Amino acid sequence: AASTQYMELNQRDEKSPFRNANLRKAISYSIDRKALVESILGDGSIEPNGLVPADMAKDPSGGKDFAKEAGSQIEYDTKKAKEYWEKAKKELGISTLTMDILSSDADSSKKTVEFVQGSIQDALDGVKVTVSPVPFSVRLDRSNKGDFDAVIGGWSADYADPSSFLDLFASDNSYNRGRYNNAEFDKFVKAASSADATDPEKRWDDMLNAEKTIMGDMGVVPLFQKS
Numbered sequence: 001a002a003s004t005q006y007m008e009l010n011q012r013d014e015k016s017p018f019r020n021a022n023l024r025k026a027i028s029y030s031i032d033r034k035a036l037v038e039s040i041l042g043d044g045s046i047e048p049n050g051l052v053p054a055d056m057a058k059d060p061s062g063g064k065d066f067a068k069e070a071g072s073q074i075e076y077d078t079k080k081a082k083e084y085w086e087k088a089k090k091e092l093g094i095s096t097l098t099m100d101i102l103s104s105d106a107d108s109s110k111k112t113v114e115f116v117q118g119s120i121q122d123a124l125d126g127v128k129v130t131v132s133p134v135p136f137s138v139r140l141d142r143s144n145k146g147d148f149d150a151v152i153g154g155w156s157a158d159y160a161d162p163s164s165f166l167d168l169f170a171s172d173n174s175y176n177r178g179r180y181n182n183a184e185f186d187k188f189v190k191a192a193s194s195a196d197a198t199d200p201e202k203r204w205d206d207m208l209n210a211e212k213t214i215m216g217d218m219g220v221v222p223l224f225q226k227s
């Protein structure tokens with residue numbers, strides 16, 4: 001029953017600013033997840049280790065948690081947010097960014113999106129962020145068709161397997177709304193999900209590598225876990 005709430009970034013277009021890993025990292029660095037969960041939400045949500053929830057899956061040989069083994073590459077640091085945005089500006093050849101965050105119009109979702117919008121906008125000089133809270137069928141439709149810059153959503157695990165989360169971000173998965181496309185991520189996540197993944201220790205290592213890959217280039221921006 002563990003869930004991760006995350007923000008997908010639209011990477012569909014070759015020239016999308018969100019295809020720049022330093023921008024995706026600058027966005028993640030600008031959000032104080034501790035404040036979000038403790039002051040804004042206060043509803044049992046916790047800081048996200050990464051994409052796959054903590055305290056959900058155990059190593060197939062010993063008793064080790066997937067999230068602990070993977071480690072965390074999620075940090076809050078606005079000095080780093082600024083530095084990474086400077087790098088992104090140079091790489092992308094841009095001076096400015098205006099981005100919309102599509103979200104649920106649910107009460108907690110509105111408070112989350114407001115906090116995320118303020119955090120990014122405030123930290124990054126030259127970035128303006130708007131928000132579009134909408135009902136479920138609209139969010140779903142726009143997410144599929146790529147009518148968004150960022151979109152907040154999440155995933156809940158029917159069974160406690162890390163691939164339930166990781167499979168979503170394969171380049172060819174329909175749940176990959178931002179069309180994240182990392183060849184190594186695909187390599188790892190498919191190697192795990194294959195019918196020819198009959199060695200559980202290799203499968204575990206493939207899934208760990210998938211988590212570390214998507215967190216390493218911040219292909220999606222996890223916001224919190226609610227387990």
Ligand code: NA
Pocket residue numbers: 120121122123124125126127128
């Ligand atoms: Na700004």
